[PDB]
Design a protein around this ligand. Structure first.
Ligand code: NA
Length: 527
């Protein structure tokens, strides 16, 4: 009912609403994106791959410094607010400033032709958020049609919008200084009202990650895990989830011809199992090649939406050109990948949990079986490194999207694992004592041993300092690399580097000891 929709938009403050393009088909979106007369960043270009490409302007990535959550009676004592104790992007916003911003955005979307897309964040009927996004730019509607679950005709008849995203990319906030904000741009959330406002930035990710942040607020409070991970399922129905920061092999190791993909980035884990929050994938395309990333490359066709890629004069795409940004992307509905779970992106309870890390310090074992306490410790640590070794720590493998304290995500994850008897493993896909990277042959052998349970049959030893349980041998894996000390000429070399890494983990974790519940976890961390 377009009549009902317009009244609800008026309620939000949008006036003089002209034509509304509600839930357009992919064909309509293509026509809208290539419409004669589009100017600026609204303009789409049909590439030779058949996919339309658009540019996002000055913002080619998220703007965490411009992210705010309204502080009110609902959020004062529930949100994990940025503090001296532990810095994060959850910056409070007054109700007065929120109102001003809402009016600003409402004004920007008034007296115009609008696109409205309604979809779901969450494949679980019990724990999903119906999202309604309003925009004046067709490709932004396309991004949402790709990234959220597309409702059935039946669902669209009784669709309830639990959260509304008002995309006012074209407007900027003139009173930001007076208001004490970061800039004239803004990505603000009002949890009580159920609204996300976007201003100044055109980057599509703000819509995807904004809703992920909201799921990260509502779900854990209901005992449901909300995770930044990929997930897949074996032919027999066995489910595994993978965590890992960029460069840890997450995408490659969770891509297996024999296991259908549930999702590649955001999942929930409730009483029924693991479910994707998304209806598509938002992949990085820099240096993309058909040879290396056949699944992703193959997905770039009509209905995919390329972002910030360089298009040559003949319409072809130079995927190696990062002139606009190194963060070139492409979004596409999930069925552009063949090896996926259908008809709905969800499966049973996970029984294997894998934490990947590229340990540039060459200290961690290629694989360790974690205790429940260590599972929480390494989940809060969210560690990886790159080469002198430089570490990166990101709580729960996605600190930027945590609306609650890290411990709250760890608690629900381990609760779900305990019920299904799931085992967690820390897997180092990085380097060892040779100074070289662990072979992918061994890493693939390790992932196989984890999934087929052979690691559970192995004789176990224990690595000192970290007190990690490690297998002495595994089918298809070089037993000479299982203990990280064996790849060094002298174990004393490992010992020195281990004390160093242990120190970095401990120093990183100190901020969590300011949280009462998490404080005791230092006992499960190194030394
Ligand atoms: Na399309």
């Amino acid at each position: 009912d377009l009549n009902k929709l317009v009244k609800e938009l008026n309620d939000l403050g949008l006036t003089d609403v002209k034509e509304i393009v509600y839930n357009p088909s992919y064909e309509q979106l293509f026509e809208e994106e290539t419409k004669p007369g589009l100017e600026g960043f609204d303009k789409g270009t049909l590439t030779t791959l058949g996919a339309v490409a658009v540019d996002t302007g000055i913002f080619t990535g998220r703007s965490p410094k411009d992210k705010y959550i309204v502080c009110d009676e609902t959020t004062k004592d529930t949100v994990w607010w940025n503090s001296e104790a532990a810095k994060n992007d959850n910056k409070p916003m007054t109700q007065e400033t929120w109102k001003s911003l809402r009016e600003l955005v409402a004004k920007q979307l008034s007296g115009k032709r609008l696109f409205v897309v309604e979809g779901y964040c969450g494949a679980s009927e019990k724990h999903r958020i119906g999202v309604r996004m309003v925009t004046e730019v067709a490709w932004q509607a396309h991004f949402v049609k790709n990234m959220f679950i597309r409702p059935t005709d039946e669902e669209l008849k009784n669709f309830k919008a639990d959260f509304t995203v008002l995309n006012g990319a074209k407007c900027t906030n003139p009173n930001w200084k007076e208001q004490g904000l970061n800039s004239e741009n803004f990505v603000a959330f009002n949890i009580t009202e159920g609204i996300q406002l976007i201003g100044g930035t055109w980057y599509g990710g703000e819509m995807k990650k904004g809703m992920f942040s909201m799921m990260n607020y509502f779900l854990p409070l209901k005992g449901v895990a909300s995770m930044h991970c990929s997930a897949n399922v074996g032919k027999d129905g066995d489910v595994a989830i993978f965590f890992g920061l960029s460069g840890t092999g997450k995408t490659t190791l969770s891509t297996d011809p024999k296991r259908q993909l549930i999702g590649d980035d955001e999942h929930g884990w409730d009483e029924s199992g693991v479910f994707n929050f998304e209806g598509g994938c938002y992949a990085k395309t820099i240096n993309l090649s058909q040879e290396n990333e056949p699944d992703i490359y193959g997905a770039i066709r009509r209905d995919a939406l390329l972002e910030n890629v360089v298009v040559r004069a003949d319409g072809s795409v130079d995927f190696d050109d990062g002139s606009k940004t190194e963060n070139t992307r492409v979004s596409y509905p999930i069925y552009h990948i063949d090896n996926i779970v259908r008809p709905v992106s969800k499966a049973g309870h996970a029984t294997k949990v894998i934490f990947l890390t590229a340990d540039a310090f060459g200290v961690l074992p290629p694989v360790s079986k974690l205790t429940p306490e260590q599972t929480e410790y390494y989940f809060l640590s969210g560690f990886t490194a790159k080469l002198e070794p430089t570490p990166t720590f990101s709580a729960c493998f996605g600190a930027a999207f945590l609306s609650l304290h890290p411990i709250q995500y760890a608690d629900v994850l381990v609760e779900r694992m305990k019920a299904s008897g799931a085992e967690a493993y820390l897997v180092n896909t990085g380097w060892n004592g040779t100074g070289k990277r662990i072979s992918i042959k061994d890493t693939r052998g390790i992932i196989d041993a984890i999934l087929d349970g052979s690691i559970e049959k192995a004789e176990m030893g224990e690595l000192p300092i970290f007190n990690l349980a490690i297998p002495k041998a595994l089918p298809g894996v070089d037993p000479a690399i299982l203990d990280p000390r064996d790849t060094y000429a002298d174990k004393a070399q490992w010992q020195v580097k281990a004390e160093d890494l242990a120190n970095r983990f401990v120093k990183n974790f100190v901020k969590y000891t300011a949280n009462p519940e998490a404080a005791k976890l230092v006992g499960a961390g190194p030394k």
